[PDB]
Amino acid sequence: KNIESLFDYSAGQFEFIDHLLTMGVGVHFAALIFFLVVSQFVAPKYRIATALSCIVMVSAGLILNSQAVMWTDAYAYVDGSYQLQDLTFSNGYRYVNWMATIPCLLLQLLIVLNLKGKELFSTATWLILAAWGMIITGYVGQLYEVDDIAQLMIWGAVSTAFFVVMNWIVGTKIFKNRATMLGGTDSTITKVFWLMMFAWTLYPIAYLVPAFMNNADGVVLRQLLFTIADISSKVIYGLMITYIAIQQSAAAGYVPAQQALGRI
Template identity: 75%
Template sequence: MKNIENLFDYTVGQFETIDHLLTMGVGAHLAALVFFFLLSRLVAPRYRVATALSCIVMVSAGLILVSQAGMWTDAFALEGGVYKLQDITFNNGYRYVNWMITIPCLLTQLLIVLNYGKKEIVKKATILVVLAWGMIITGYVGQLYEVEDLNALCIWGAISTVFFVAMNFIVGTSIAAQRKTMTNGTNTTIMKVFWLMMFAWALYPVAYLVPAFMNTSDGVVVRQLLFTIADISSKVIYGVMITYIAIRQSASIGYKPALKALGRDVNDDLRI
């Protein structure tokens, strides 16, 4: 795989920064896995699939980052005070494989807490998954050219962006349409989720374009920083907010564990 990470030598500081970023990503996802598993009992069956999907996302993303971290330390060795590429190369392509799993899960979680019925969830999720896969596949193809042909990188990136915009348009209109159905104050929280998604997901195309505007060893550090911020924001923090919404809405339909977790009397009527 011809990624720009393999083009440069790295100072000890640069190498260790990337190593620490990848390790931090692993730790954040594995810690979140435990968190979501423990909180799943507080979520009513109606919303529990959303929390289960968070667990799937954490496992999938965590394993990929373990692989990325191991690949990084295997690909370079310290020689003459700098880290130089060895026989094994570093590969960002595995991230795209991971996104084929995690992004559909994230989108389905959102539809569940938006109180769509089963048929509507299946319908919308199918459309969103197709758009997400179109975005990911075209992005994957584009990053194959990042070393040899920046024009091709940008062209495939533009195609990927079309899918990206269409997907987010559906996400935005779905939230707007369903906000009125959300209970216990979660209609305001869901807008925070939307803006978190827009922030985190916008970091990925910036990282994708790093070879076009910062094709240096420092650019590689910036790219891995952007990936780490985006991963933790779009998966871990997003999952926490989705779980919060699920618990609040579970309480509003009288689910006792959720009521107790929120410090409310089980006889309270929280339907609003």
């Protein structure tokens, strides 16, 4: 149902996608280890945000590692190309993790914005229905990424709207609660907002590969645009979300965070 099943791959194409996903496993699980160790230097009120990235990291992780195994399961070298065998590959399982990866990030962004209580829970509930929104219409479109490209843009169209709509929430929150933010991180938080519009725009581009490049190199590009969007919303966004909590933790008087920052 997917363009990936349409082609045979040269060995270079196939080894490259495999090294991509594998390098992408190496990284979520090695970011995973950093996010563990620095969690002791984060104040009790921010510490779930570091932890949440421990989850992001295992979750893109598993599916990423899972895509790499299914890649080598699905294809074998026959007569000079890698050809599809008995099992399929697909990015279908990538959109389900998006289901889980985002609320969590959205959650760690909300946590360091210093949202609390009813605004925090409320804004989490809306944010989560919205991207969940964006995510599932994404899902249903790529379903027709071979049979019915009209549903790709049309479902593309729909999921985009949600993406616009949700950025609006996040941005409003971010620029509203800049002034609560301690240690200089009111400057930093606007940067993440920006970074975050890059990694998540890689996605629609990654989602129009069949419309505009329905061949084997588009399959590869699509995965390439997957590893960076991936590394950026999960790993770099993550890295960047960690620094604000430690900074704000030292600003609020958390001596392990002070000591950690002063050590560097």
